[PDB]
Amino acid sequence: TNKLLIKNALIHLTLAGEVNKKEREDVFEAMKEYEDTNQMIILVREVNVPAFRALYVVVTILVKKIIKGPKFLTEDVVDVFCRYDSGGKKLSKLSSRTFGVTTDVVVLKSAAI
Amino acid sequence: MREIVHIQAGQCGNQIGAKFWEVISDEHGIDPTGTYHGDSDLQLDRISVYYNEATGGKYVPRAILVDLEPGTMDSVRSGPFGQIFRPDNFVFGQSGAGNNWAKGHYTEGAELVDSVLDVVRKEAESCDCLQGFQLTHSLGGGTGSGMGTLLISKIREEYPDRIMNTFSVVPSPKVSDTVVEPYNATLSVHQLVENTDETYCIDNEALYDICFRTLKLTTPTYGDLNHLVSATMSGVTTCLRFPGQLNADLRKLAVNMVPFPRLHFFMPGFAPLTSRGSQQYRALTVPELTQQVFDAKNMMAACDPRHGRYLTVAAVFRGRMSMKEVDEQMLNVQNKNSSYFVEWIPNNVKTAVCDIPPRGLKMAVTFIGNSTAIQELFKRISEQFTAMFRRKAFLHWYTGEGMDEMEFTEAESNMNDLVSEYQQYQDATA
Amino acid sequence: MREIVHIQAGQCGNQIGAKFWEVISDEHGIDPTGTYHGDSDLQLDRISVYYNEATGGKYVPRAILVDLEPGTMDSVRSGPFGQIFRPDNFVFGQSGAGNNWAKGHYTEGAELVDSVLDVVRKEAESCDCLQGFQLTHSLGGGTGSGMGTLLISKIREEYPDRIMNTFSVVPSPKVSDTVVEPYNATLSVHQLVENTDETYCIDNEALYDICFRTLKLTTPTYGDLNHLVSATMSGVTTCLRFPGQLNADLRKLAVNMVPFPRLHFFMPGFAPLTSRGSQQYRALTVPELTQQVFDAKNMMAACDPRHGRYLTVAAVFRGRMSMKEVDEQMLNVQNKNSSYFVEWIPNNVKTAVCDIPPRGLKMAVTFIGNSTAIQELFKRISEQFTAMFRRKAFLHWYTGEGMDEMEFTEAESNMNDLVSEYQQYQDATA
Amino acid sequence: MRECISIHVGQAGVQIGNACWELYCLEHGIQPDGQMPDSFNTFFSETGAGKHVPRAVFVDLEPTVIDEVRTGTYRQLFHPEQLITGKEDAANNYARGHYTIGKEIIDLVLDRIRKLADQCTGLQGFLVFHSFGGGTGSGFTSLLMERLSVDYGKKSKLEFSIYPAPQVSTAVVEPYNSILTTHTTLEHSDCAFMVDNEAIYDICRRNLDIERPTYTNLNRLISQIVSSITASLRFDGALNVDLTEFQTNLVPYPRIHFPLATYAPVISAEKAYHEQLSVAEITNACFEPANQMVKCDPRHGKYMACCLLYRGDVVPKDVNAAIATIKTKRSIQFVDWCPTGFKVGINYQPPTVVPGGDLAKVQRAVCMLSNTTAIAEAWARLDHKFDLMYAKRAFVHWYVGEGMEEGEFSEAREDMAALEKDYEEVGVDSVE
Amino acid sequence: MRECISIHVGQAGVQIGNACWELYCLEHGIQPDGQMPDSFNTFFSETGAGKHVPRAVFVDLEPTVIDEVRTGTYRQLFHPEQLITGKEDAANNYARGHYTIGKEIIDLVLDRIRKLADQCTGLQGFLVFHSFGGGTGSGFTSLLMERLSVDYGKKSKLEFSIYPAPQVSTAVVEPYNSILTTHTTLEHSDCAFMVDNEAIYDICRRNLDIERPTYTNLNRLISQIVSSITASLRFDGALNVDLTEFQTNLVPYPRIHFPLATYAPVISAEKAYHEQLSVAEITNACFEPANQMVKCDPRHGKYMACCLLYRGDVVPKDVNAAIATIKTKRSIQFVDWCPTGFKVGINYQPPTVVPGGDLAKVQRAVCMLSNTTAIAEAWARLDHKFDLMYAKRAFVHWYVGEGMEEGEFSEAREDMAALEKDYEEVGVDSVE
Ligand SMILES: CC(=O)O[C@H]1C(=O)[C@@]2(C)[C@H]([C@H](OC(=O)c3ccccc3)[C@]3(O)C[C@H](OC(=O)[C@H](O)[C@@H](NC(=O)c4ccccc4)c4ccccc4)C(C)=C1C3(C)C)[C@]1(OC(C)=O)CO[C@@H]1C[C@@H]2O
Ligand SMILES: Nc1nc2c(ncn2[C@@H]2O[C@H](COP(=O)(O)OP(=O)(O)OP(=O)(O)O)[C@@H](O)[C@H]2O)c(=O)[nH]1
Ligand SMILES: Nc1nc2c(ncn2[C@@H]2O[C@H](COP(=O)(O)OP(=O)(O)OP(=O)(O)O)[C@@H](O)[C@H]2O)c(=O)[nH]1
Ligand SMILES: Nc1nc2c(ncn2[C@@H]2O[C@H](COP(=O)(O)OP(=O)(O)O)[C@@H](O)[C@H]2O)c(=O)[nH]1
Ligand SMILES: Nc1nc2c(ncn2[C@@H]2O[C@H](COP(=O)(O)OP(=O)(O)O)[C@@H](O)[C@H]2O)c(=O)[nH]1
Ligand SMILES: [Mg+2]
Ligand SMILES: [Mg+2]
């Protein structure tokens, strides 16, 4: 999997600090019964400010829903397809429009909302 | 134009203000006498924002000094930068407050208010265009919490459409250097939230760690704590009185910053803060000046910013730099702190740049926070007020000086409503 | 770009690194202050692989110095090349581990660990593009085996897609300078085989013979054992920061080298090693530097290379030479050692050439071995572990510091599985 | 002959004007003192004595940047009755620049324009320089378009509006000053230009290798674009364009009049070599997302109409060669109902370099002006800020107690609600 | 005219090109600063000002060797947008040059090529220089033949692959980076040249009496061979050959397109005397095992289609006399089905000596590009190295954890399983 890439990104870019300690501790154990799933991706509202809205899984081609947000993902509704950089805790924008083994950070579209 | 009258108060602010005019006279090259020795002619282009000019090229600080004992006023008049003031402006009584909000507002405050407001009226006529009044006091004592909040309940009566920034040195959480500071604060916040547009709430305990951890000192005297506070006091209004690439004043730092008519409690911050020998190990760059600011250990208010969320953030810079570096770094620290910023205010980073650094540095940031991180500061005061009211200790010094017991229940339900607005109208994210 | 953060820990790793930064300052022409005095501008091409560049042209090492008592920290700060570091980096405790793996990982290490990882986080953001982390410690002691392997159980939780080379000065076979070093090592190899990509294991006994036999010295001080170790630490990364013909880095010296995800325990080797007066008896040539390397009496790990077999071989050369002589001699030593290499890996010699020699010589070779000949190093420790656990000597210092007796059963079948994987997957020939 | 006056509202207008009126003095040999060592009689009504003075009004409410003009390099150039100061700024309060303070000095500005508007007879157009951010650049244009479209009405008016960026923000009520002015400036403007803050930094970093630019250097790249709209009023050309022509060629409806500028070539002095700069080369540089000056993907929407204001030694056949390449391409897709929406103007003067400036000395240039569909996303942005900063009624009491009814805010979104549907209306194709 | 661009993937592609682009500047009088004190319009899209800049794309993932080009002798020559750097190399990992890092800047290369293919209309071919060793070399190339054979498709494409040497080796996964790229580069290349590292040391030691060569002096011999293929484009000859003519005569089947160079005279300066250099002398020098730049015995297998590219002072009668000797000789045995598989190109210009170089100034040269059968043993070699490094699953976890299925490794040998049989399928003689 890429389990250390998402779990590091949960408490350093998306849900970080004393404010949302109710929030992220609720969603560690929600994906504890999961994460044997070979890939999980997160959702981000804007590339301007990376904030958490949805944690998703990819079960082997269909994106299931887990804990707010839509249920299935297509190539059309998602604007960018990014990669979590570990060195500077920012978002590496991948050039691949489709899915991949590596990508985790996605941003939806206001036309899909 | 756009003059500022600098009303002082209390034992605290008169020793802050004794250091603040030491800061301002050096930026404009002013001696202890009152003449001019500055290098840049850009100094005297806006010397009339603080300094009325008199005969012989002398300048006087537009400053009104208020006390109830002749104690600190005798110290400042004999101290350095003491002869520069006007001997008419020194207003003082003889009874002395002596740590009593009941005395500083009714017993002695409400008898020597007209020896002050006439001198205010003299200086409002000295103004070409009245901009706003700044007051320097403390919620802890008796004079600065009693006489100041009487004058704010008189100035907005008389000058209702001018901005009123107050400095109130908030009592620290751990040590209590006043036994009735839960009674000199709660009876002042009631008077400040209805008649002040902005209040630069500054703690003490957080200001010692900056002297300990960051400056790396051993013996922090008050001459090196107010020295750091007056660095921030001039950092607000320096964008007014100097040419900048992106200009700002007291009003632009009021309109962009106050969303609701009650939530106007600011927690400042300053950078760079070097050491004496460790000054030559860090790079003096805009990505380095900003990352110093947005931590917790360089907030002058002793409350955790990671508890509670920011609403509006001002970053008044100084010095000459590159605007892309600023616009990049106001994003880069907004990317990683995006969990801390609030949802329903997008692009909540106000920016302003000057073109003159402080005298000796190369570049400097002055930070003006506004968070829900100060909800536990008032939760602390409203809980110390709760225990001392149930035993009703220390009550006979107030009731005997003309004050009712329901007024202590008025302010406690007042502040516990205001703590809820940092919780009701914080997490409303539609 | 491609920055390297140099964490130091323990008493040993700090004294190694205090000689290693003496090396790097001299290749790049850095004074004791931190300014520049080098001759060739090729030093400053990749000067940002180890150095945050501060103001005034000064450079500071990207170095984080960790200890649990200020004994060695007071030595290095008052020693030579001591002022070059950052006084923010010197994070240290007060209690001291004192030869106790259970103290430096649970008791004292697991309380002041977040005072280190903030400065680690601060320097990863100082990077332009993070390449990897090099830790310098020793398995024998308490701090370098307890505090260090705690940090690898934190950094891989934080920086999982980077490379983590460690130097761990292994206890020598014959003499033991620590009573419970069979307990400081077996509880550390468990914390290195799952979390480090490569590990340059160094024995002590082999490093005394080279000072005795080949260098021909009488009194080998630690200032001349680490001096021979620091010649190798800057023998690996010198292809990453200098323009060579066939370039290699910290990653190409990991992908070509580590066939299975567990067998990453290396044994270095340096040449030429002259004497003080016997240098004028040998021709300084490429067929002469190679034949010095592949013997037994110039391996820094005290294990007989003829016992067991190599899997892979890396021979990082330095200095300017001819690429046929390299291609010939790497063939030639595989002719005569054709029974000492392994069958099922053909062309098992990785080679790279730099174009700048060490300052003063003409050419130098940094050999990076990899063999099954380190199976008896672990057969030695896990047999010393076996008797001292049967009588369960020295057990109450660990049980009383937060540890169960099952952990000595976990780590014992751990290493006895590792020795079998140098025997199960050694003689598999097809 | 034909004369046009310039108005500089707010700080962003004045500091741009400090860069414009440096450039026009250099393009004609005009000294900073108004001296010079006949086509330039459009911007400079001269004295009978030997001195040219500009046709400029620098209105401002705070006296900070005006005193930097009165003490700057161009002290002697201006007539000091033009430089109009004030007392206290509107200070990012929209009702403090349209109601409270700007009403006090509205007679001094209009009467000073009234003296300039009867200095000649070819009163051509209006150049207004302002932003949308602050309280003057959008709070005093909307009053000054209210007056000058009642005094004159039948003229042509140009607004060079600095656009509020999607990423970079130096204000907090930055959407509480654009929706308020678009209630007013929509139905009385002619052609409002959009220039973005963010998209110039991508052009200053990548295409110039300047990593640390300044607002000195951003304002040069807007002064060059302004000096190519009015290039034909100052120089003889093959195919001249007029300010009375841009209202006709580029405004297909009484609502949609929002073009986004585009300039080429933007390359440094060291990269002024190494390429050949044909007009087949410099035209394809304009039609890429690498050279946009609004942060929008142009390959999302469709170009309705375009324009190409070439200048320098340009061969008019190769223009016709370079255009015919474009319309037969895959990515560039116009709207179906427009036959072909180009409009080409060749002028005979190369752009002049500024000393100590960024740009190299090139021979040919282009100021593409494009009224495209894809700015609708940039208008969908500043409704979403109004969607969230108004359900909680943030920052409203600074507006209500300054001569402004807060029932107007539910009305001004319906202005923008219709305008977002109009780009969706025109962008689809009328079948049958 | 007829223009051909050159892509230099990997370090070995760059360092060969560092020796190539020294030679084209000398073979035309071009200074290193792009100056000169009409046939050279095939690699040098010149400026209108006097400067010639090469048609070359240098791509690399690690910034080391690019900074040696950006500080070398040819600093001023290149257009600096061509020099595409990266951040961190693929580092002998195939799935780090095709999935992880190569996908980052694949649009930075293709869009930069996109602004070169629209500089001339005679887009002739491609010259991808790359090795098989490194992670960039055969890992970023196989993505680029994927992309350019979908953009262009119908063009002609040429590789110059530094072959992994049979006995000497400087990597460990060097038999992994070739079997993985041959799954990808086979169905998109059209003539992939094998040049061996080991066989050049046999020529530099023996035929030159230079005992200590360098990669400076092994690249000179590959720079002379590339300047013997494109010599007919750059000069006038009696019997010219073109880069569409190589792909027809040399590819007898859509799989087998693996030729190997050969070059005579490789002799020193002291032995430039003592013989006579007739074209019947040096022709037999090409057909010796002592002048084979792949370490294989040519007298084991057969030649399917040789090709001789003479140049300099060459008389075409003696060529026909030299060929008439060869087909009657005993050891050289062609294949039965081919009638006669020669293809001769006589050119006029001699090879020019490089100053400080190895070779003498000779009058004539030959680049025998033989497509032989005997390279099948060299493909039988890298199936033996694959299998003993796959039954133990050596080095697999550095591939699986970088975006690569480990079921694919049982398939790329099945690619080579058919291709090993095809040489044995064609090399036999069809009876009846
Ligand atoms: C006049 C002259 O040329 O003197 C030489 C010298 O004579 C010899 C004998 C040196 C010398 O080495 C020793 O005496 C020695 C003593 C104890 C342990 C190791 C070495 C030399 O000290 C060492 C020194 O090496 C360096 O300067 C390298 O840069 C080296 N630097 C250090 O080790 C170093 C020493 C002190 C302080 C800081 C650094 C190095 C090697 C590898 C990687 C990085 C740096 C050299 C060439 C010289 C002297 C001075 C005598 C030799 O060693 C090295 C490492 O170069 C020993 O055999 C070589 C051959 C050298 O010719
Ligand atoms: N292009 C450009 N924009 C600028 C420059 N300086 C400031 N701006 C923009 O100006 C906008 C702010 O508008 P202002 O006119 O200054 O505000 P105002 O309140 O109306 O006027 P003042 O308060 O009197 O300065 C911001 O969006 C800035 O990006 C500059 O040099 N160039
Ligand atoms: N003929 C020749 N071969 C070279 C030269 N430089 C390197 N090589 C060969 O290149 C092979 C190594 O693979 P490379 O592709 O060059 O490595 P790289 O291009 O740096 O790729 P990465 O480092 O993995 O990104 C070895 O066989 C070297 O002998 C050179 O100048 N000439
Ligand atoms: N920062 C700062 N705080 C001060 C100083 N002097 C007093 N204080 C604080 O002021 C509070 C006491 O109030 P004080 O002003 O002296 O009493 P008052 O004269 O009745 O207003 C305590 O919290 C003190 O720590 C000073 O010079 N600097
Ligand atoms: N090579 C080398 N080994 C050292 C040095 N100092 C200590 N050691 C070795 O380190 C081991 C003791 O560990 P130590 O690091 O001092 O204890 P710790 O501080 O608890 O990690 C012994 O095997 C020593 O021989 C030194 O300077 N050089
Ligand atoms: Mg302004
Ligand atoms: Mg490489």
Numbering used by the authors:
A (entry chain W): 634 to 693, 730 to 736, 738 to 783
B (entry chain H), C (entry chain G): 1 to 44, 47 to 360, 369 to 440
D (entry chain A), E (entry chain C): 1 to 37, 47 to 441
Quote the study's own text:
At the molecular level, CAMSAPs/Patronins stabilise uncapped MT minus ends and support MT minus-end growth. Previously, we showed that CAMSAP/Patronin CKK domains preferentially bind to a zone behind the extreme MT minus end, which corresponds to a region where the lattice undergoes a transition to gently curved tubulin sheets. Using this, we determined reconstructions of MT-bound CKK domains on both 13- and 14-protofilament pseudo-helical MTs, allowing visualisation of a wider repertoire of tubulin conformations. The reconstructions show that both NgCKK and HsCKK form an intradimer interprotofilament wedge, contacting both α- and β-tubulin subunits in a tubulin dimer pair (with constituent monomers numbered α1, β1, α2 and β2).
We also investigated the CKK domain from Naegleria gruberi (NgCKK), which does not show minus-end binding preference. It has a typical CKK fold, but sequence differences compared to HsCKK are reflected in structural differences in several loop regions. However, NgCKK MT binding is shifted relative to HsCKK, resulting in a modified interaction with tubulin including even smaller contacts with α-tubulin, contrary to our previous prediction. On the other hand, in NgCKK loop3—which is one residue longer and positioned differently with respect to the MT surface compared to HsCKK—the residue equivalent to R1528 (R678) interacts with loop H10-β7 of β1-tubulin, possibly hydrogen bonding with E345 (bottom). Intriguingly—and in contrast to the HsCKK—the intrinsic protofilament skew in both 13- and 14-protofilament MTs was unperturbed by NgCKK binding. However, HsCKK forms different and more extensive contacts with α-tubulins compared to NgCKK; the looser interactions between NgCKK and the α-tubulins suggest that sensitivity to tubulin configuration is thereby absent and explains why this protein does not specifically bind MT minus ends.
